[PDB]
UniProtKB/Swiss-Prot annotation, chain A:
Involved in the nuclear export of mRNA species bearing retroviral constitutive transport elements (CTE) and in the export of mRNA from the nucleus to the cytoplasm (TAP/NFX1 pathway). The NXF1-NXT1 heterodimer is involved in the export of HSP70 mRNA in conjunction with ALYREF/THOC4 and THOC5 components of the TREX complex. ALYREF/THOC4-bound mRNA is thought to be transferred to the NXF1-NXT1 heterodimer for export. It comes from Homo sapiens (Human). Belongs to the NXF family. Heterodimer (via NTF2 domain) with NXT1. The formation of NXF1-NXT1 heterodimers is required for the NXF1-mediated nuclear mRNA export. Forms a complex with RANBP2/NUP358, NXT1 and RANGAP1. Associates with the exon junction complex (EJC) and with the transcription/export (TREX) complex. Found in a mRNA complex with UPF3A and UPF3B. Found in a post-splicing complex with RBM8A, UPF1, UPF2, UPF3A, UPF3B and RNPS1. It is found in: Nucleus; Nucleus, Nucleoplasm; Nucleus speckle; Nucleus, Nuclear pore complex. The chain holds residues 203 to 365 of 619 of the full protein. Expressed ubiquitously. The minimal CTE binding domain consists of an RNP-type RNA binding domain (RBD) and leucine-rich repeats. LRR repeats lie at residues 64-89, 90-113, 114-141, 142-163. This is Nuclear RNA export factor 1.
């Protein structure tokens, strides 16, 4: 566990990485963060307790959060951040690229998020599909309201039962 | 402690103590030793000796927990009763200690609910010595359709503990029996405090609540 002093430091570093205007929290490669490294604080987000401390700080400080970038954090399983639907209710953009997610099922653990944009490129789960087509389906399955995927805009959801 | 307890088959010992006195406290046998202290010197061996009373989960187990939870589920009303889970007969019998006030266990349970009872409407977690509601903040994610939550008889000291689960669109709630209750002076303040976290609430501790009077 991070001592109170360290949590305050993390709080500070996250605060520096938060863009009130865009309402984006950039937690990319958090481990190798300069300030964190400088003060010898090792935040390993793919470790329960750390994702927890991080999430608590998001819950208690930027509840209105809309965009969260967790790219490049060796995240291999999303269940450790499942309570996020609870903490960042308003979240609508999530960047999970460059992590170590081997399957798209990992996404069932955060299924409650009403994501409009998501990134998964850089995850081995990617070379698990054979065509951008199946891939998009598999993913829209968890987030139907998804508007953009991996940077590319997506065709408005074709509902079969129209009239 | 129960001197010369080993000299006695837990089954008979356990049933006899109860018979005059019921659930384990992480027991173990040391050498010859193994409404309660009221049992001291009350039981008798057939040898005319009186029994003195000096006062992770491996898969197959989860399968068992999942199973007991299964028995506790009433698909008719969609209600999972996990009241006093720790002392569940079967779990006890099978030697499985499920302490819900412990993250890891609250997790395993919440996982089983997520994977097997997505439509769950009512969940009873009373008498589980819970004092930390943050171990189930993911409840909102795992039990999307929860509308009834019974937390009575636990050890929640403050209403703020509820903040960890504000997202649940509860319609009915039970806090009755928590020290947080003797923290309020009047029922009127308590009600309003609770509604802060659950504006759609309709029933609290069994009673119906007046509709909200918006201004």
């Amino acid at each position: 566990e991070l001592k109170p002093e360290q949590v305050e430091q993390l709080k500070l570093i996250m605060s520096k990485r938060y863009d009130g205007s865009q309402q984006v929290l950039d937690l990319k490669g958090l481990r190798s963060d300069p300030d964190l490294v400088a003060q010898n604080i090792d935040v390993v987000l793919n470790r329960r307790s750390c994702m927890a401390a991080t999430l608590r700080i998001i819950e208690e400080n930027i509840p209105e959060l809309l965009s969260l970038n967790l790219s490049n954090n060796r995240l291999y399983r999303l269940d450790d951040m499942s309570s996020i639907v609870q903490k960042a209710p308003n979240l609508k953009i999530l960047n999970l690229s460059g992590n170590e997610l081997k399957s798209e099922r990992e996404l069932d653990k955060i299924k409650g998020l009403k994501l409009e944009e998501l990134w998964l490129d850089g995850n081995s789960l990617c070379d698990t599909f054979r065509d951008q087509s199946t891939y998009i389906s598999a993913i829209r399955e968890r987030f139907p309201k998804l508007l953009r995927l991996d940077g590319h805009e997506l065709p408005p959801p074709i509902a079969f039962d129209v009239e």
